């Protein structure tokens, strides 16, 4: 291509904001670029967005005396000539620290092949189907997120309860250790004085303490098993959301691409808004 | 989850199984509201029944120990507190010897209760940075305490009751004309008498009146520096010598035309009422490195493996780890990805190299990384989804580069985060061990690598190193908003003209965006410019504290500007954003936390909201530890106010529990049985004692008193918010308000409402300053926790839906305003309604809040119009507040015609002036919405959202074009207007 109008250029996008540019320049290779109208919205700016070092670098093109250029002097007839020149030659002429080639253009013609059945009612019905499928997918993802947050609170409360149970076991085992400490060398006094009623009641007290600590062991073990089961369910819900998420993102991309194609095809927005 | 594990309210008969030091076990039937000392009393009474009573010692030498519901062995030197408030996990109490200082442990219990998590795990956590912060923040705590005790008892009164003023000593022209020759009719209410008898005097004094001379002519009219002015109905005092009209109460009385009423109290009475803050010094305070720049190597990090990743095997084939070295939000080099290993065995053993050098690493460099999963076998497009994320500070708090192994526990993906990496997220490992963990390995350079100090940086400066004609480009870059379309041409122009940028102080945020932080010489030069930079305004200074400027010296310059310009009132206005940008700090110990704590410990009004803003996000585990440590520091050094805060917490948690037993147990039956259960639960004495006589969290000056049980109800909304009505213990406070109504709303997040009302208050302030009396009604809203908070209720106001229902139409609202206040004050009500409508229309269009219906917009009896239940602000273009004909009739004074209405033309003029004022001050609004990203609202995550308020304010278009933009928006609202 020797020279072509910028409206027919693949890299030129026209009237869009920085946000969709960042979405289309997101995690792409070095040198990926597009040309859009500047946000100041006056004729003749035609700013360029390039990706270098993982950053969305943004360059301004001036429109003095009917020409174009990155800086003074302006030695380009059209923006397409400048784009081709910096597409064949590195941009280091303007700035030596920007050692990057304009490798890949963000072509709006690339996403045209995604949509099929170009007639208006077919794309309307297809947009309706993907939009409602996105609706059940999103409501499933939010219900799963709600369940995940609730189960996470249950994990936190159950873990706090287990930690309290372990500290209770430490308390009661310290009590049993003190009982043994004050009883090991002192039951000989019981043997000399020879009363069996006090022996049987202190053994009853030790037995009921043993029953209490065994019951607390049983409760701690049961709640630990419940925590393991509920954490397994937590893992399953997390896995389910991680499975849903790429599908939801793909449905979002499909809906956005269909809406953009309908907007650029001259389709009425209000005629498609109320179908949902 | 209440007073026992699994039991909300314990039965009146409680079988405690206490634990004896001798070795015996008791089974004691304990009284319901019993205190611990009598529990020990008939513990030792029945101790004689069981053997080994001879080994037992006196009652007073022994202390109860038990495990609470927060998993810690609490020991109880506080015998005066009842068992209901003890929060037992199981009913047992071990009796042992003293093991520590009593006052320290009682203070620790109060601090842990106020925070909501124990100080014991702050002691037991082995992070050196946490312990070093806990030790070093006590220095500024002690300095703030000493400054608070510098001019005792006057400075203590300043701390407890700070002056509620605003910044400007002077008055706007549109309210100076509101007074008869600049005179304020003020009523001073002296209760000083042999009996408790009120009596009054009326004074016609000036607007620049010091309260000392106010009481001077008060005594002169009575028919001497020992009296103070206290505002009727609340704990607001006029202490420091300031103009009278500068106080917020007097200013609000000038705003609304209400009669200012004040006490005349003795200085000695307040000085004896205030106690001495016993700042006990905590116990834990007792407890060959080569430079960064001399390393000739590239930065590489080794990914070992992941212990487990929560991903399905038959839906996802491969997973990888995407990394990247970031400086805030912008990468210092290209992101590097690990090899796409199968998801069954996340085992990597892979070195990752980066396009950056070891000396080129900036001080605030962070390794942001995320395990991610691939997809796309069906179709030619392949997508990567975020799966788990984590950030590591490449330099720790000791200025040392990380090295060796590091087990980083990753965080769950934020809701609605498309981005593979999350550089805006917090740093550090996840405390939850049930999270995916990744083993990182940073390269070992045979020594400890330390970032160079200021000396080496300054020596590197001045080594790599007439006014120009076109200096207007610098001003043009300065005047644009922080999220402007800044080019590499403007960046190179800024960096090539950095020496001449010092003559425009407010261009520093742009210049810091021009410098590339992956270059050592540029970083050193920009540091040299920062060191000698002139101070900037606080509104511009807080911009340098968001996620876009993570550099410690940039944030230090911003904190110094906050020290040297920012006032207490603007700090209170901007306390939400300054608290939220504490998460953006990479280290617990920084200058911003010291500034916020020092200002919070010298101002109870500032410190109260500081405590509550930190407390409202303790549920967020991303910032739980840092805010918990800060809350520990504040609660140690605040003094007596902690007890008051404890009372507040009690009430709040009680209300939370009540709302719990209102919203997941009995949400199905009719409302009347719910009201019966409400009055039964709230009539019980301990709920009363928790809900009686505590300071209002919405306003610490408003001291809530007796609770009227007859009119505490539930509205018919979706989440069933709880209406509370409180009395005032003082008997003559009928002048300001006889009642305190508060909506306790749980389930709906109120951080959105807090941000919206703060922004609305700021628009009100800008409009009042410019010359427009465009009064808003930013009612008090304070979130207290996870989707739970408080809302101040506007007295004598009804929703438009209630007005329409009670009148029965289009003319019913104007008819109601005609009927409520007719006569010569009808014109004032009409002008008030029109003007408040214009201001709220402009604010709602600019903020773009959720769809407005008649249920969520209210009008007062005097005609003031205001908005409630914001919720969904910005985007979650669409004008929500379309001016309906119900308002067209009232603005046009009931005229059928609306297009050719002169009052409608004045409405247009006020709206246009408001839009131009907010467009002129939009830099502050963009700054405040950018500082709020780390909170995590569902509709505020990245700058893509702030582009909405960028577009509605028409900051991209010229100043003139915004006029026609507002024209077109209002004409589309009216279908021609």
JSON list of C-alpha atoms in Angstrom, two decimals, chain A residues 17-19 23 26-30 36-41 47 51 53-55 57-62 69-71 94-95 97-98 114 141-142 145 148 152-153 155-157 159-165 167-168 170-172 174-175 178-179 182 186 190 198 201-202 205 208-209 212 216 223 227 231 234-236 238-239 242-243 245-247 249-250 253, chain B residues 1 5 17 19-27 49-52 54-55 65 67-73 89-92 94 308-312 315-316 322 326 330-335 373 375 381-383 385-387 412-416 418-421 432 434 483-490 492 516 519 522 621 786 943-944 947 950 956-957 961:
[
{"chain": "A", "resi": 17, "resn": "UNK", "atom": "CA", "xyz": [-11.41, 6.60, 25.12]},
{"chain": "A", "resi": 18, "resn": "UNK", "atom": "CA", "xyz": [-8.23, 5.51, 26.90]},
{"chain": "A", "resi": 19, "resn": "UNK", "atom": "CA", "xyz": [-9.95, 2.68, 28.78]},
{"chain": "A", "resi": 23, "resn": "UNK", "atom": "CA", "xyz": [-8.15, -3.14, 27.37]},
{"chain": "A", "resi": 26, "resn": "UNK", "atom": "CA", "xyz": [-3.50, -5.38, 27.78]},
{"chain": "A", "resi": 27, "resn": "UNK", "atom": "CA", "xyz": [-0.65, -7.89, 28.26]},
{"chain": "A", "resi": 28, "resn": "UNK", "atom": "CA", "xyz": [0.34, -7.73, 24.58]},
{"chain": "A", "resi": 29, "resn": "UNK", "atom": "CA", "xyz": [3.76, -8.03, 22.99]},
{"chain": "A", "resi": 30, "resn": "UNK", "atom": "CA", "xyz": [6.18, -5.14, 22.51]},
{"chain": "A", "resi": 36, "resn": "UNK", "atom": "CA", "xyz": [-7.08, 7.06, 17.81]},
{"chain": "A", "resi": 37, "resn": "UNK", "atom": "CA", "xyz": [-8.49, 10.55, 18.14]},
{"chain": "A", "resi": 38, "resn": "UNK", "atom": "CA", "xyz": [-7.09, 12.44, 21.12]},
{"chain": "A", "resi": 39, "resn": "UNK", "atom": "CA", "xyz": [-9.34, 12.93, 24.13]},
{"chain": "A", "resi": 40, "resn": "UNK", "atom": "CA", "xyz": [-9.27, 16.73, 23.67]},
{"chain": "A", "resi": 41, "resn": "UNK", "atom": "CA", "xyz": [-11.61, 16.09, 20.69]},
{"chain": "A", "resi": 47, "resn": "UNK", "atom": "CA", "xyz": [-2.65, 10.32, 18.82]},
{"chain": "A", "resi": 51, "resn": "UNK", "atom": "CA", "xyz": [3.20, -0.75, 24.05]},
{"chain": "A", "resi": 53, "resn": "UNK", "atom": "CA", "xyz": [8.24, -2.31, 28.47]},
{"chain": "A", "resi": 54, "resn": "UNK", "atom": "CA", "xyz": [4.77, -3.43, 29.52]},
{"chain": "A", "resi": 55, "resn": "UNK", "atom": "CA", "xyz": [3.65, 0.22, 29.47]},
{"chain": "A", "resi": 57, "resn": "UNK", "atom": "CA", "xyz": [3.22, 4.64, 25.91]},
{"chain": "A", "resi": 58, "resn": "UNK", "atom": "CA", "xyz": [1.25, 7.42, 24.23]},
{"chain": "A", "resi": 59, "resn": "UNK", "atom": "CA", "xyz": [2.64, 9.75, 21.54]},
{"chain": "A", "resi": 60, "resn": "UNK", "atom": "CA", "xyz": [1.13, 12.91, 20.06]},
{"chain": "A", "resi": 61, "resn": "UNK", "atom": "CA", "xyz": [1.07, 13.75, 16.34]},
{"chain": "A", "resi": 62, "resn": "UNK", "atom": "CA", "xyz": [0.92, 17.43, 15.41]},
{"chain": "A", "resi": 69, "resn": "UNK", "atom": "CA", "xyz": [4.93, 14.49, 12.61]},
{"chain": "A", "resi": 70, "resn": "UNK", "atom": "CA", "xyz": [5.95, 13.38, 16.07]},
{"chain": "A", "resi": 71, "resn": "UNK", "atom": "CA", "xyz": [7.87, 16.61, 16.71]},
{"chain": "A", "resi": 94, "resn": "UNK", "atom": "CA", "xyz": [12.51, 10.44, 17.47]},
{"chain": "A", "resi": 95, "resn": "UNK", "atom": "CA", "xyz": [13.81, 9.15, 20.82]},
{"chain": "A", "resi": 97, "resn": "UNK", "atom": "CA", "xyz": [15.54, 5.37, 24.40]},
{"chain": "A", "resi": 98, "resn": "UNK", "atom": "CA", "xyz": [12.36, 4.07, 22.70]},
{"chain": "A", "resi": 114, "resn": "UNK", "atom": "CA", "xyz": [-15.60, -13.43, 14.82]},
{"chain": "A", "resi": 141, "resn": "UNK", "atom": "CA", "xyz": [-20.70, -16.68, 39.50]},
{"chain": "A", "resi": 142, "resn": "UNK", "atom": "CA", "xyz": [-22.13, -14.20, 42.03]},
{"chain": "A", "resi": 145, "resn": "UNK", "atom": "CA", "xyz": [-18.94, -15.96, 45.24]},
{"chain": "A", "resi": 148, "resn": "UNK", "atom": "CA", "xyz": [-17.49, -18.81, 48.89]},
{"chain": "A", "resi": 152, "resn": "UNK", "atom": "CA", "xyz": [-14.68, -18.57, 54.16]},
{"chain": "A", "resi": 153, "resn": "UNK", "atom": "CA", "xyz": [-16.27, -16.95, 57.21]},
{"chain": "A", "resi": 155, "resn": "UNK", "atom": "CA", "xyz": [-13.54, -21.56, 57.91]},
{"chain": "A", "resi": 156, "resn": "UNK", "atom": "CA", "xyz": [-12.31, -18.55, 59.89]},
{"chain": "A", "resi": 157, "resn": "UNK", "atom": "CA", "xyz": [-14.79, -19.13, 62.74]},
{"chain": "A", "resi": 159, "resn": "UNK", "atom": "CA", "xyz": [-10.32, -22.34, 62.84]},
{"chain": "A", "resi": 160, "resn": "UNK", "atom": "CA", "xyz": [-10.72, -19.88, 65.72]},
{"chain": "A", "resi": 161, "resn": "UNK", "atom": "CA", "xyz": [-12.84, -22.51, 67.51]},
{"chain": "A", "resi": 162, "resn": "UNK", "atom": "CA", "xyz": [-10.17, -25.18, 66.92]},
{"chain": "A", "resi": 163, "resn": "UNK", "atom": "CA", "xyz": [-7.46, -22.87, 68.28]},
{"chain": "A", "resi": 164, "resn": "UNK", "atom": "CA", "xyz": [-9.62, -22.17, 71.33]},
{"chain": "A", "resi": 165, "resn": "UNK", "atom": "CA", "xyz": [-10.08, -25.93, 71.71]},
{"chain": "A", "resi": 167, "resn": "UNK", "atom": "CA", "xyz": [-5.77, -23.87, 74.23]},
{"chain": "A", "resi": 168, "resn": "UNK", "atom": "CA", "xyz": [-8.54, -25.45, 76.34]},
{"chain": "A", "resi": 170, "resn": "UNK", "atom": "CA", "xyz": [-3.52, -27.07, 77.17]},
{"chain": "A", "resi": 171, "resn": "UNK", "atom": "CA", "xyz": [-5.41, -25.59, 80.15]},
{"chain": "A", "resi": 172, "resn": "UNK", "atom": "CA", "xyz": [-6.98, -28.90, 81.20]},
{"chain": "A", "resi": 174, "resn": "UNK", "atom": "CA", "xyz": [-1.93, -28.38, 82.81]},
{"chain": "A", "resi": 175, "resn": "UNK", "atom": "CA", "xyz": [-4.62, -28.89, 85.45]},
{"chain": "A", "resi": 178, "resn": "UNK", "atom": "CA", "xyz": [-0.83, -30.11, 88.63]},
{"chain": "A", "resi": 179, "resn": "UNK", "atom": "CA", "xyz": [-3.22, -32.71, 90.06]},
{"chain": "A", "resi": 182, "resn": "UNK", "atom": "CA", "xyz": [0.15, -32.45, 94.19]},
{"chain": "A", "resi": 186, "resn": "UNK", "atom": "CA", "xyz": [0.73, -36.95, 98.93]},
{"chain": "A", "resi": 190, "resn": "UNK", "atom": "CA", "xyz": [-3.69, -41.29, 102.50]},
{"chain": "A", "resi": 198, "resn": "UNK", "atom": "CA", "xyz": [-11.60, -39.74, 100.71]},
{"chain": "A", "resi": 201, "resn": "UNK", "atom": "CA", "xyz": [-14.15, -39.40, 96.26]},
{"chain": "A", "resi": 202, "resn": "UNK", "atom": "CA", "xyz": [-10.83, -38.03, 94.97]},
{"chain": "A", "resi": 205, "resn": "UNK", "atom": "CA", "xyz": [-13.22, -36.32, 90.99]},
{"chain": "A", "resi": 208, "resn": "UNK", "atom": "CA", "xyz": [-15.12, -36.93, 86.13]},
{"chain": "A", "resi": 209, "resn": "UNK", "atom": "CA", "xyz": [-12.24, -34.63, 85.14]},
{"chain": "A", "resi": 212, "resn": "UNK", "atom": "CA", "xyz": [-14.72, -33.92, 80.80]},
{"chain": "A", "resi": 216, "resn": "UNK", "atom": "CA", "xyz": [-13.57, -32.00, 74.98]},
{"chain": "A", "resi": 223, "resn": "UNK", "atom": "CA", "xyz": [-15.12, -30.04, 64.82]},
{"chain": "A", "resi": 227, "resn": "UNK", "atom": "CA", "xyz": [-13.53, -28.12, 59.34]},
{"chain": "A", "resi": 231, "resn": "UNK", "atom": "CA", "xyz": [-12.62, -26.74, 53.67]},
{"chain": "A", "resi": 234, "resn": "UNK", "atom": "CA", "xyz": [-14.55, -24.47, 50.07]},
{"chain": "A", "resi": 235, "resn": "UNK", "atom": "CA", "xyz": [-11.91, -25.81, 47.68]},
{"chain": "A", "resi": 236, "resn": "UNK", "atom": "CA", "xyz": [-14.65, -27.19, 45.42]},
{"chain": "A", "resi": 238, "resn": "UNK", "atom": "CA", "xyz": [-13.17, -22.03, 44.57]},
{"chain": "A", "resi": 239, "resn": "UNK", "atom": "CA", "xyz": [-12.45, -24.51, 41.76]},
{"chain": "A", "resi": 242, "resn": "UNK", "atom": "CA", "xyz": [-12.14, -20.60, 38.63]},
{"chain": "A", "resi": 243, "resn": "UNK", "atom": "CA", "xyz": [-13.78, -22.80, 35.99]},
{"chain": "A", "resi": 245, "resn": "UNK", "atom": "CA", "xyz": [-14.39, -17.23, 35.20]},
{"chain": "A", "resi": 246, "resn": "UNK", "atom": "CA", "xyz": [-12.80, -17.78, 31.73]},
{"chain": "A", "resi": 247, "resn": "UNK", "atom": "CA", "xyz": [-16.22, -18.64, 30.29]},
{"chain": "A", "resi": 249, "resn": "UNK", "atom": "CA", "xyz": [-14.84, -13.38, 30.42]},
{"chain": "A", "resi": 250, "resn": "UNK", "atom": "CA", "xyz": [-15.28, -14.95, 26.97]},
{"chain": "A", "resi": 253, "resn": "UNK", "atom": "CA", "xyz": [-15.82, -10.33, 25.10]},
{"chain": "B", "resi": 1, "resn": "UNK", "atom": "CA", "xyz": [-21.43, -16.22, 68.32]},
{"chain": "B", "resi": 5, "resn": "UNK", "atom": "CA", "xyz": [-19.76, -20.60, 71.41]},
{"chain": "B", "resi": 17, "resn": "UNK", "atom": "CA", "xyz": [-16.85, -26.05, 85.85]},
{"chain": "B", "resi": 19, "resn": "UNK", "atom": "CA", "xyz": [-10.49, -25.46, 87.77]},
{"chain": "B", "resi": 20, "resn": "UNK", "atom": "CA", "xyz": [-8.70, -25.49, 91.10]},
{"chain": "B", "resi": 21, "resn": "UNK", "atom": "CA", "xyz": [-4.94, -25.03, 91.62]},
{"chain": "B", "resi": 22, "resn": "UNK", "atom": "CA", "xyz": [-4.95, -27.84, 94.20]},
{"chain": "B", "resi": 23, "resn": "UNK", "atom": "CA", "xyz": [-6.44, -30.26, 91.67]},
{"chain": "B", "resi": 24, "resn": "UNK", "atom": "CA", "xyz": [-10.18, -30.33, 92.34]},
{"chain": "B", "resi": 25, "resn": "UNK", "atom": "CA", "xyz": [-13.11, -29.78, 89.97]},
{"chain": "B", "resi": 26, "resn": "UNK", "atom": "CA", "xyz": [-16.29, -27.93, 90.96]},
{"chain": "B", "resi": 27, "resn": "UNK", "atom": "CA", "xyz": [-19.74, -27.80, 89.35]},
{"chain": "B", "resi": 49, "resn": "UNK", "atom": "CA", "xyz": [-16.21, -29.37, 100.54]},
{"chain": "B", "resi": 50, "resn": "UNK", "atom": "CA", "xyz": [-13.67, -30.95, 98.18]},
{"chain": "B", "resi": 51, "resn": "UNK", "atom": "CA", "xyz": [-10.30, -32.15, 99.51]},
{"chain": "B", "resi": 52, "resn": "UNK", "atom": "CA", "xyz": [-6.92, -30.38, 99.36]},
{"chain": "B", "resi": 54, "resn": "UNK", "atom": "CA", "xyz": [-5.40, -26.87, 103.03]},
{"chain": "B", "resi": 55, "resn": "UNK", "atom": "CA", "xyz": [-3.18, -26.22, 100.00]},
{"chain": "B", "resi": 65, "resn": "UNK", "atom": "CA", "xyz": [-8.13, -17.67, 83.60]},
{"chain": "B", "resi": 67, "resn": "UNK", "atom": "CA", "xyz": [-10.35, -19.24, 76.94]},
{"chain": "B", "resi": 68, "resn": "UNK", "atom": "CA", "xyz": [-12.50, -16.69, 75.12]},
{"chain": "B", "resi": 69, "resn": "UNK", "atom": "CA", "xyz": [-14.26, -17.01, 71.75]},
{"chain": "B", "resi": 70, "resn": "UNK", "atom": "CA", "xyz": [-11.27, -15.35, 70.02]},
{"chain": "B", "resi": 71, "resn": "UNK", "atom": "CA", "xyz": [-8.91, -18.27, 70.82]},
{"chain": "B", "resi": 72, "resn": "UNK", "atom": "CA", "xyz": [-6.70, -16.91, 73.59]},
{"chain": "B", "resi": 73, "resn": "UNK", "atom": "CA", "xyz": [-6.29, -17.79, 77.28]},
{"chain": "B", "resi": 89, "resn": "UNK", "atom": "CA", "xyz": [-15.87, -20.19, 74.78]},
{"chain": "B", "resi": 90, "resn": "UNK", "atom": "CA", "xyz": [-16.57, -22.92, 77.35]},
{"chain": "B", "resi": 91, "resn": "UNK", "atom": "CA", "xyz": [-17.74, -22.41, 80.97]},
{"chain": "B", "resi": 92, "resn": "UNK", "atom": "CA", "xyz": [-14.50, -22.98, 82.88]},
{"chain": "B", "resi": 94, "resn": "UNK", "atom": "CA", "xyz": [-8.85, -21.84, 86.25]},
{"chain": "B", "resi": 308, "resn": "UNK", "atom": "CA", "xyz": [-1.50, -26.56, 45.63]},
{"chain": "B", "resi": 309, "resn": "UNK", "atom": "CA", "xyz": [-3.54, -24.47, 43.19]},
{"chain": "B", "resi": 310, "resn": "UNK", "atom": "CA", "xyz": [-7.35, -24.55, 43.32]},
{"chain": "B", "resi": 311, "resn": "UNK", "atom": "CA", "xyz": [-8.05, -25.27, 39.66]},
{"chain": "B", "resi": 312, "resn": "UNK", "atom": "CA", "xyz": [-9.96, -28.05, 37.90]},
{"chain": "B", "resi": 315, "resn": "UNK", "atom": "CA", "xyz": [-11.59, -27.77, 32.42]},
{"chain": "B", "resi": 316, "resn": "UNK", "atom": "CA", "xyz": [-8.14, -26.13, 32.54]},
{"chain": "B", "resi": 322, "resn": "UNK", "atom": "CA", "xyz": [2.97, -14.21, 35.37]},
{"chain": "B", "resi": 326, "resn": "UNK", "atom": "CA", "xyz": [6.36, -2.71, 39.29]},
{"chain": "B", "resi": 330, "resn": "UNK", "atom": "CA", "xyz": [3.39, 1.00, 36.02]},
{"chain": "B", "resi": 331, "resn": "UNK", "atom": "CA", "xyz": [5.84, -1.82, 35.20]},
{"chain": "B", "resi": 332, "resn": "UNK", "atom": "CA", "xyz": [9.57, -1.17, 35.38]},
{"chain": "B", "resi": 333, "resn": "UNK", "atom": "CA", "xyz": [10.13, -3.88, 32.74]},
{"chain": "B", "resi": 334, "resn": "UNK", "atom": "CA", "xyz": [8.22, -6.29, 30.53]},
{"chain": "B", "resi": 335, "resn": "UNK", "atom": "CA", "xyz": [6.22, -8.95, 32.35]},
{"chain": "B", "resi": 373, "resn": "UNK", "atom": "CA", "xyz": [-4.66, -20.35, 34.02]},
{"chain": "B", "resi": 375, "resn": "UNK", "atom": "CA", "xyz": [-7.92, -21.61, 28.12]},
{"chain": "B", "resi": 381, "resn": "UNK", "atom": "CA", "xyz": [-8.55, -17.07, 20.70]},
{"chain": "B", "resi": 382, "resn": "UNK", "atom": "CA", "xyz": [-6.79, -18.01, 23.95]},
{"chain": "B", "resi": 383, "resn": "UNK", "atom": "CA", "xyz": [-7.49, -16.22, 27.23]},
{"chain": "B", "resi": 385, "resn": "UNK", "atom": "CA", "xyz": [-7.67, -15.75, 33.79]},
{"chain": "B", "resi": 386, "resn": "UNK", "atom": "CA", "xyz": [-6.38, -14.59, 37.19]},
{"chain": "B", "resi": 387, "resn": "UNK", "atom": "CA", "xyz": [-6.18, -17.45, 39.66]},
{"chain": "B", "resi": 412, "resn": "UNK", "atom": "CA", "xyz": [-7.79, -14.62, 46.40]},
{"chain": "B", "resi": 413, "resn": "UNK", "atom": "CA", "xyz": [-8.60, -12.81, 43.16]},
{"chain": "B", "resi": 414, "resn": "UNK", "atom": "CA", "xyz": [-10.44, -9.51, 43.76]},
{"chain": "B", "resi": 415, "resn": "UNK", "atom": "CA", "xyz": [-14.03, -9.42, 42.56]},
{"chain": "B", "resi": 416, "resn": "UNK", "atom": "CA", "xyz": [-14.34, -8.20, 38.98]},
{"chain": "B", "resi": 418, "resn": "UNK", "atom": "CA", "xyz": [-9.83, -8.60, 34.73]},
{"chain": "B", "resi": 419, "resn": "UNK", "atom": "CA", "xyz": [-6.13, -7.77, 35.20]},
{"chain": "B", "resi": 420, "resn": "UNK", "atom": "CA", "xyz": [-3.77, -10.73, 35.42]},
{"chain": "B", "resi": 421, "resn": "UNK", "atom": "CA", "xyz": [-1.58, -8.87, 37.93]},
{"chain": "B", "resi": 432, "resn": "UNK", "atom": "CA", "xyz": [-4.50, -17.60, 55.90]},
{"chain": "B", "resi": 434, "resn": "UNK", "atom": "CA", "xyz": [-5.45, -22.35, 53.53]},
{"chain": "B", "resi": 483, "resn": "UNK", "atom": "CA", "xyz": [-5.53, 11.35, 34.84]},
{"chain": "B", "resi": 484, "resn": "UNK", "atom": "CA", "xyz": [-4.73, 13.48, 31.79]},
{"chain": "B", "resi": 485, "resn": "UNK", "atom": "CA", "xyz": [-3.55, 12.25, 28.38]},
{"chain": "B", "resi": 486, "resn": "UNK", "atom": "CA", "xyz": [0.13, 12.84, 29.08]},
{"chain": "B", "resi": 487, "resn": "UNK", "atom": "CA", "xyz": [2.35, 12.18, 26.06]},
{"chain": "B", "resi": 488, "resn": "UNK", "atom": "CA", "xyz": [5.95, 11.10, 25.70]},
{"chain": "B", "resi": 489, "resn": "UNK", "atom": "CA", "xyz": [6.40, 14.56, 24.17]},
{"chain": "B", "resi": 490, "resn": "UNK", "atom": "CA", "xyz": [5.12, 16.15, 27.38]},
{"chain": "B", "resi": 492, "resn": "UNK", "atom": "CA", "xyz": [10.32, 14.45, 27.67]},
{"chain": "B", "resi": 516, "resn": "UNK", "atom": "CA", "xyz": [11.24, 6.67, 34.38]},
{"chain": "B", "resi": 519, "resn": "UNK", "atom": "CA", "xyz": [16.78, 4.39, 35.50]},
{"chain": "B", "resi": 522, "resn": "UNK", "atom": "CA", "xyz": [17.01, 9.76, 36.61]},
{"chain": "B", "resi": 621, "resn": "UNK", "atom": "CA", "xyz": [-7.63, -9.53, 55.92]},
{"chain": "B", "resi": 786, "resn": "UNK", "atom": "CA", "xyz": [-18.43, -5.47, 57.07]},
{"chain": "B", "resi": 943, "resn": "UNK", "atom": "CA", "xyz": [-8.98, 4.63, 36.94]},
{"chain": "B", "resi": 944, "resn": "UNK", "atom": "CA", "xyz": [-11.37, 3.30, 34.28]},
{"chain": "B", "resi": 947, "resn": "UNK", "atom": "CA", "xyz": [-12.91, 8.26, 33.76]},
{"chain": "B", "resi": 950, "resn": "UNK", "atom": "CA", "xyz": [-13.65, 12.81, 34.13]},
{"chain": "B", "resi": 956, "resn": "UNK", "atom": "CA", "xyz": [-11.01, 16.75, 28.39]},
{"chain": "B", "resi": 957, "resn": "UNK", "atom": "CA", "xyz": [-13.04, 19.45, 26.64]},
{"chain": "B", "resi": 961, "resn": "UNK", "atom": "CA", "xyz": [-17.40, 23.45, 25.82]}
]
